[PDB]
Amino acid sequence: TIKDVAKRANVSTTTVSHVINKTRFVAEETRNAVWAAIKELHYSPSAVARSLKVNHTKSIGLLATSSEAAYFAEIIEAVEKNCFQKGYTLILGNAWNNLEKQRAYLSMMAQKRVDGLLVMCSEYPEPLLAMLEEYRHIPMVVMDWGEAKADFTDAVIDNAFEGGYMAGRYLIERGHREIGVIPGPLERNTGAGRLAGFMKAMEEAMIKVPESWIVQGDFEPESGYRAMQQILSQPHRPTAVFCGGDIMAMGALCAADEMGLRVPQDVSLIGYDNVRNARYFTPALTTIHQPKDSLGETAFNMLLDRIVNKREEPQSIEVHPRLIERRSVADGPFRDYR
Amino acid sequence: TIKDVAKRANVSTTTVSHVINKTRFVAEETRNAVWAAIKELHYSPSAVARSLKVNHTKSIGLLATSSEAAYFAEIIEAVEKNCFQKGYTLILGNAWNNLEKQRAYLSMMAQKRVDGLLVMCSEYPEPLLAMLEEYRHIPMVVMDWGEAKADFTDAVIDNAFEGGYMAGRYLIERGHREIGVIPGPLERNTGAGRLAGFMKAMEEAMIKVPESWIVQGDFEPESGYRAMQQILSQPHRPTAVFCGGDIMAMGALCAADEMGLRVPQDVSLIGYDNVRNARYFTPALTTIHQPKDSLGETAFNMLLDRIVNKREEPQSIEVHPRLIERRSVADGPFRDYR
DNA sequence: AACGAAAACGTTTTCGT
DNA sequence: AACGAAAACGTTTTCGT
Ligand code: HPA
């Protein structure tokens, strides 16, 4: 088809290619004539052919977990903005935490020859770290670890522990001493790490968390629902709760209401993530905000770098969570006494 | 690199290619030897080369509006499941309703030579219908129109009007006669069409909607927020409200609460979409459900068809909305009298 | 029986002059 | 000055025998 264009125009394909890519000077007349043809012939230059030669697809592949979850979804929309602006094409793939599913997309990706790879897998067992490393040659960044699990990749780090700590500290300073917590999955950073950040503040204050007050969640609203319930469904209940993710908080909130308990009036609740629409939770949710957009833009960037400036050394950038006060928390019993 | 494999194995690339694609019989011995090499050499067959020849990329491109919005996001996660299972690669692109942005991704897409194109643009002006048709040769389906706007594409249709109608009819039959409505954008099917489905039921019942009771939204929680407010912020207010989308409902709900009005006790509210987590709205939201997943799987399918069975004739499939009763609606003044 | 040799797919790019 | 001819990128596939 470039051949076809060359001929309607009566110049060499070499010519046509030069004008289409402004890669060498071409007389106006010639240049026009080309476009002329380019047009009527209705030509779409082939990226496949092109990549075949120049050696890069100008496309990036996101090997994610899932994409419906608010959290994830916001991150993804961000990464996409960035590919778009720097000319990349996004290939989105959800592995749902399945090794097989993962071994597959990974390979499909390599085969399609993505210029780099963004990794958001949530949980990383040895088996997965292992496949990951077989692709060390394709440049890549992990957007969701706490520390840097490997040497063959870039890492953007969230400081999830200091998020955890901030959350607890707020409750503490608000008068609270009987706190419960519904962490998310311990096999995830945003799961374990937020918890532990919360747990230090507790020890620090000599607050002890009765095991019957800690109930695992899985980031989904339903998990929050059941965990709330189980908490408030007992003789002795805390006055405040730290919930590992906004969406689950949202479920925690529904149950409180269902049991006719008032928030924050009967139970205070603090979440985490600061999802796009936690302000419209009822009540407006007080939570820890995760820089979602910078987590994304920051990831795209270390990758480009590696890609463009051909970097070989691993790198890591920290990002920082911060408290957003809204209306789901009220002073606790000890406020006045400090 | 296939050449490299051929040689470690001492067979022809032709051979290697036959075993890698099981496209002709190869002796075990030979077959093994190949894999052998395939392995140590650590070979990843090139899809780019391959597509270059066989003529198809085995990849589909989603030219969407945005992907953070619950609604959209759920649809997308669906389409992705389907590509994955039928071997396709997904290229996600958000045009945010911008013509330019649209003219771009469209072209980037063609150039990358996607096997087909899924279209979800929300609004379709002539200018966009126009670009769309310049790509009539790349097979495509529009997942969001009400009727079939063109002849050069497939259409999956939602019956949004009969969704609108169902919603109104519920309110009516619950005792309600003073209803307000916050529709979404009239330039969108899910905007206009839901409204009109609602508006017929009204006329049908001789209920009239005071213009001061209809306030445009844009599907975002904030728009619901402002529109609620404006409704309840006036001398005479309705007792029930029909809100064009769940997320905006969610915002409508927050404001009611903020003005200290009770739902459903003070105002009844019915939404639309049945987003994944409307059940955890507070109160659990009564709404019209949109088959999201079938809207997706149904789209992927007409496309495959066109792609695989090489279809030329346009086609359209209807899908059907349905009421989900939860807890945001209560009987109105006229319940007993019917 | 089981496999090779060689052209082609649609570009980009080196050297020409 | 302004442009062409021809090889190459990494596969698949037709005909061989
Ligand atoms: O794994 C996760 N899933 C969903 N939301 C989240 N927010 C933090 N981590 C997660």
Ligand code: HPA
């Ligand atoms: O355009 C839309 N955006 C978001 N949610 C929606 N639900 C129906 N239509 C829409």
